[PDB]
Design a protein around this ligand. Sequence first.
Ligand SMILES: Nc1nc2c(ncn2[C@@H]2O[C@H](COP(=O)(O)OP(=O)(O)OP(=O)(O)O)[C@@H](O)[C@H]2O)c(=O)[nH]1
Ligand SMILES: [Mg+2]
Ligand SMILES: [Zn+2]
Lengths: 79, 189, 149, 199, 87, 50, 352, 228, 230, 119
Amino acid sequence: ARVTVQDAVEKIGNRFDLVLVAARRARQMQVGGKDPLVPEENDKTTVIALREIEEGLINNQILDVRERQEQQEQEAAEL
Amino acid sequence: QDLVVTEDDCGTHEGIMMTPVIEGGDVKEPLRDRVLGRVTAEDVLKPGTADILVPRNTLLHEQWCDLLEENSVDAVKVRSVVSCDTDFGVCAHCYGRDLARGHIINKGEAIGVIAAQSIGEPGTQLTAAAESSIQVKNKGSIKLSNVKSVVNSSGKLVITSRNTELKLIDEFGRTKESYKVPYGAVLAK
Amino acid sequence: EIKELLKLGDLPTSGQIRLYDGRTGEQFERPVTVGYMYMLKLNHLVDDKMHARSTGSYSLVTQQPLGGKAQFGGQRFGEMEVWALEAYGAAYTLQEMLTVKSDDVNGRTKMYKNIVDGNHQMEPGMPESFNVLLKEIRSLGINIELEDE
Amino acid sequence: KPLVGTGMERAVAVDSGVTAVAKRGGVVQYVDASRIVIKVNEDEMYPGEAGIDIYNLTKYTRSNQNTCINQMPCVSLGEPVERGDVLADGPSTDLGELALGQNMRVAFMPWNGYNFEDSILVSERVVQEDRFTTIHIQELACVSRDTKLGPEEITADIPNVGEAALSKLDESGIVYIGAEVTGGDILVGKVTPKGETQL
Amino acid sequence: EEFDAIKIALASPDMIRSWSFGEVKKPETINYRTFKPERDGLFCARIFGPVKDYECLCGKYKRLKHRGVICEKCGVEVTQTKVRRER
Amino acid sequence: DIVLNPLGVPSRMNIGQILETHLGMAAKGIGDKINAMLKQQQEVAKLREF
Amino acid sequence: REEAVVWDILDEVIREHPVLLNRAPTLHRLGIQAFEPVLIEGKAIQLHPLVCAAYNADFDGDQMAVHVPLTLEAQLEARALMMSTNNILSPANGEPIIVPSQDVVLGLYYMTRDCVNAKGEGMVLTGPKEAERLYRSGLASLHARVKVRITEYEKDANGELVAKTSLKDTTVGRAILWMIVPKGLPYSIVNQALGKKAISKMLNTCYRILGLKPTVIFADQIMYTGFAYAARSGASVGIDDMVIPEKKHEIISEAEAEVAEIQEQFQSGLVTAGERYNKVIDIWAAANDRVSKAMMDNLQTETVINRDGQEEKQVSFNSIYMMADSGARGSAAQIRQLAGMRGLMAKPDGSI
Amino acid sequence: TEFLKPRLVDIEQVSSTHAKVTLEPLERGFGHTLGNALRRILLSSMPGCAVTEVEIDGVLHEYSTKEGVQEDILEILLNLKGLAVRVQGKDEVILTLNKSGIGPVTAADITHDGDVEIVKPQHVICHLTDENASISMRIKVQRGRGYVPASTRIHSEEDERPIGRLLVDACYSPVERIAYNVEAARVEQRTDLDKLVIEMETNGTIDPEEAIRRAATILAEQLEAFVD
Amino acid sequence: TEFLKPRLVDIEQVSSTHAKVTLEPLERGFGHTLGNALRRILLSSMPGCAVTEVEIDGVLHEYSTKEGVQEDILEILLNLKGLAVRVQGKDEVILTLNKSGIGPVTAADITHDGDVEIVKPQHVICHLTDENASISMRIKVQRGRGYVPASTRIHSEEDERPIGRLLVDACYSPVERIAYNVEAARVEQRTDLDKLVIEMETNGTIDPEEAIRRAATILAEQLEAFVDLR
Amino acid sequence: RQMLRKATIVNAGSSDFLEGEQVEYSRVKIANRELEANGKVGATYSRDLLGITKASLATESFISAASFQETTRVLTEAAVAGKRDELRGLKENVIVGRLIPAGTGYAYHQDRMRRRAAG
Ligand SMILES: Nc1nc2c(ncn2[C@@H]2O[C@H](COP(=O)(O)OP(=O)(O)OP(=O)(O)O)[C@@H](O)[C@H]2O)c(=O)[nH]1
Ligand SMILES: [Mg+2]
Ligand SMILES: [Zn+2]
């Protein structure tokens, strides 16, 4: 969260993987301009990803599943 | 530098038997605090061998440790880094708790560096000889392990062993105080 | 002799006084030692010591930033400081400090452009100090090659 | 001066040489914020040369650590003085005694962590009274060299420069005496001959 | 470039020749007057590369247009000055 | 003027600063008496006595 | 040009952006920590007291390196792994390093410590709020021994917290500190006179029962209350603070005629240089301990406090004694050479 | 004079009892000037009602024990200190509490009385153990201000004092806690400028927002003697 | 509310600088409430007049030395900080000081301007050694409040930089010292009723009486904001 | 554990052990696991203690050995052996300015090791 990131560690577990997953999500919002699931409330992309992980919306597996979905939609469009 | 947590569980039963540092009467370092946050090896129950109390690879939390003290367990084989089978690193279970986090160590943590730093720091930062008579603090019976002494014309037991360990046993039969007797000593009893 | 002198001043022999807090007006709950200490302002003024750097000139051979405030220098990230990042997790912070922040010439300009572009992406490379090391070992007549994937 | 001293204070101030001390003594003929002229007494005054000592005082000069060296006159106009009396005080000297800093009303007691580990809590009154206000004189040089392309010019005529900047430089390209300056202001204008003009 | 490993081995006389772009015959560094690199000296531009980006020594070829164009007259390759750190 | 921390004395074992402070106040005590007598003019005889 | 709009933009960038602070020497990993920066006017870096332990930071001119983690990844590794809050326990031993001292511990000690009767001994209050109101009203000392009604919250077998109300025999000050204490903890934690040693245990206990955010808030609260009551008190040093044992010269003159008798016996014939060296060192070493013990028995206690009628003995509120007993700064050893006897000094050879 | 006035900005009302009040912008030093001045009035000068005297039948002094009652008389009195009372018209009212049987005696068992209003009728006073036990008392509520203890009441008032009348502390003040925090209000230009955060905590007889208004009013009433 | 207002009772004026002010009757606790609140405004907020700019002819900067003058320009400026000035009408007045010959230059040598009043005419500014020496300067006195150092004033406006003006500190604040004592006012019935004794020590300018009136005014102005807006 | 890294070997297995070669314990255990399943010549071993300085120079990364101490000697012995450093350790990766094989980098580094199996 804002202050401390303990809760988001408790969702995923490995501090190291927490950082990778929060990084990947923050990159989506930074570059892709992906819309945040929680109200922004003037928060940086680093903190928003941690909010989304805390509440259990963002996760390595979930991100991978939606990557496949958008990627398959684009394959559909190209063919 | 190379030592990193590579595996979660090597599934080895090996364990460094750690005893309570009881040197100089007052227990210097308790066994509870010496095995606090370390994976246990071998289903070690209570005195009465008929029902398992503790399992195998199980993180010793402050709660488990408090149970250990009611039963007064003296010796515990615990899983250690040295006896870990993992090739090219060590297992989260052989190590135990990341003392800085207060829970089981995360795989990928650079343990060796932390070890070297933590041994090195105190040294770098840190940069009464009236021991004549042993007087015993609590009543009990004299236990002399490793001792070969000769009786002198006084009536008294004059020790002639080099390694001499006087211990203070209670009633139930636990070791509670230690006292390094030297060579050339007169024992009262 | 000091207490005798204090009595001549009609000041207390203890040299402790009743003090009142300027903020609240209430008294402090016990007597406080007050008097005159001769104090010195040493040459170490903060004005002279504060220094900060984002990007600057870079060293001739090693291509790392210079040292010292007079040369507009980056702070030295020493072995000791590196080990701290090793103990933690922090692998990206470390690589940053090794590469786009020091030698990596292409990397530092590319990442500067990314930070103004607001990309906050590293794109690492090869530290020029290492390229030098290779050249210095080949100058000794030792073949040191990079073996490819 | 130091209120709680030892007595070495005066010895050090005199022997350091930074104080002007009277060799001959006699009565002071003329004080000035620059000079002291003393008329010598007949008993030490030799009958050969004119018996008037002149001590020129050093005014506000740079030290090696860029601190300030200033001599002020101690005595008043028409004061009788003996041999070995202090005529002018050096930089960190009171009437003859050595004065390295400033004594202050101090109280030993915690504040709201504003004196945590040796941290010091000071009154605004100290700043107001300009006690521990310190004077520093820095020396900057501008060198006109001769290069393979040709000699460098110290003109006020400098390519790509605001009138704001050139206002402070006079005809030759030198800043005026008394002029206040801040980082980036030009002190001595200098231009260097460039060979290749390829753009 | 991204590689797997690094190996170290004794340099063959012929291996050493491979890296070389010429034999420095003379101790001459630069000319005292035109502070430019001397013939087949220690700072020879003909061997180590051009002093200035995409510019030969005698100055006949300039600008990024001329790329790898070894000037016939002085014998200096028109590439970046960076090369003189690697050759 | 200045508020210094008591805890930076007994560990440091420089007790000189405290004696300097007590004497410093006594010195200034007598300066404050002379300042008071000079503000009220008073007698040269009385100043001389004190 | 440092235009006014630029400051507003800079404020916006620094928001939620962590910065690394480093102090030399970096002996262990806590020599680097991440913080969220707070823009301040002035040229000095402001460091949080409680982390000064990890850095071995004391403000007599130490400096620190600042480093900016640029990438999103580096920002996340700083916020999650390297943040001050997240590195509370040391990597070496389980004991934590983050713990206030000095003024902070001094203020807590003064309040917690209870004196004889004082203002309003043996009153009864409805909770810590009546206590606070009494103290601030000026009808009660912080050290008044009065019974108050406090409601502690003990955790049950599950996640639910059980509430328990009981009368406690503590002091006004400790009741008011209970207000800072989060629900879960026992009242017995604040009921002793608190020092730095007890407060470290308090924060560790709170961390293992309640968790991270509560201990973070609780740590801040302890710092604020500690400073606040630290300036409300105002203990200091003096010249009479250092008490000297009355029976010091009696133990000095005895020891001194004794050593004299052995020096006269030296010319006689019972003594080598080594034997007499040992005998004189033994005599002075025992004298030193004697004078130190008598000095510590005239300083620790030796408080004649007339209780509500007759005389009592209680612990001394002598300033230096409180500093030493609280563990705020000097130890008994430093007070041995302050008001006691300096002792036997050892030559550079190591011989005494 | 470039006078720089503050204005009441945010009123977080966490509860009817607890309410935080941020205040800006304040000039340097006015944070503590206004903070403390108000804190002192709000503690020692906010007026209110409180139990002064209690007379229980079959009780000669406060140290005895009544059978069928778990709490000693002292503990009962301490609960009556916490009894929240409003008197509308009169300055002094004597309320009667008669109750019997097994159960927690609450403040609702007090005989109403038209003008008097008991803010917390569920307030615990006594626990009755045996059903045959009955408790009867006459509780005197006076209006005053600040904190007037029995120790400061016996030393000043030495008039009528018969045995049996149990005197308890009377916390007239409706404000239970008050603390003010000065935080930096980084202001358009001034960094010296601060905000005042007053964290108030009453019982609910007086509104925090109204209590602050009253405290400032008392302060300005004292400044009428100094003309402007 | 049996409200109980104090009224200004006794004004002992020990000197033009020092003045004691007893105040009664005060209700219990209002002694310290008013005492400190007033002390803080009287130290930080008090309005006054003080020397802001000085321009001496033949003087480019404050570090030079003028011939025939014992004191360096810095020391002269520090003496002008201590110059006690009242401006009646205008906010900013420029006084002229021209003096020659041997003598201690006093404040009386300034051309007495009509509205402006120099409180201490004997105030020493300069010592002239040589008879041929003459000093001429134009001293600007501005009205403000608190403490405005030359360093805080060298980082704000500075629209024009006339090589020849010297900025010096000017303590606008007339109040040098203030302390308040709460004594018991053994009131007809109440013994907790108290008096407030304010010992003020100013330099020149502000009248003690007038200053207390102004400080109470500023506090009451600040309370209008809280009594009004909720 | 790092002190007890190396071990001397007696006899031969299916690899090149013979009398008294000093090889790391992990690598001889790997050999012994495949040997016990398949058979071949069994190899008796004996763990050796190395005190810190020598243990660090005995590491099979010469970039870590060189960076530590004795750089001239380390590089002659590596140059003559034609030794190949695959950059397994942390010091090795820090020198080339790469991601550490630990903490954050352990995820990425394990992905590269599986990229060695195919593509
Ligand atoms: N790293 C380093 N630290 C130094 C050096 N010289 C002094 N110090 C530190 O400077 C500090 C000076 O004393 P303190 O740190 O205040 O000592 P302390 O442990 O707080 O004990 P007290 O003085 O009794 O409060 C010590 O922590 C030293 O470690 C140096 O050369 N290197
Ligand atoms: Mg220290
Ligand atoms: Zn050419």
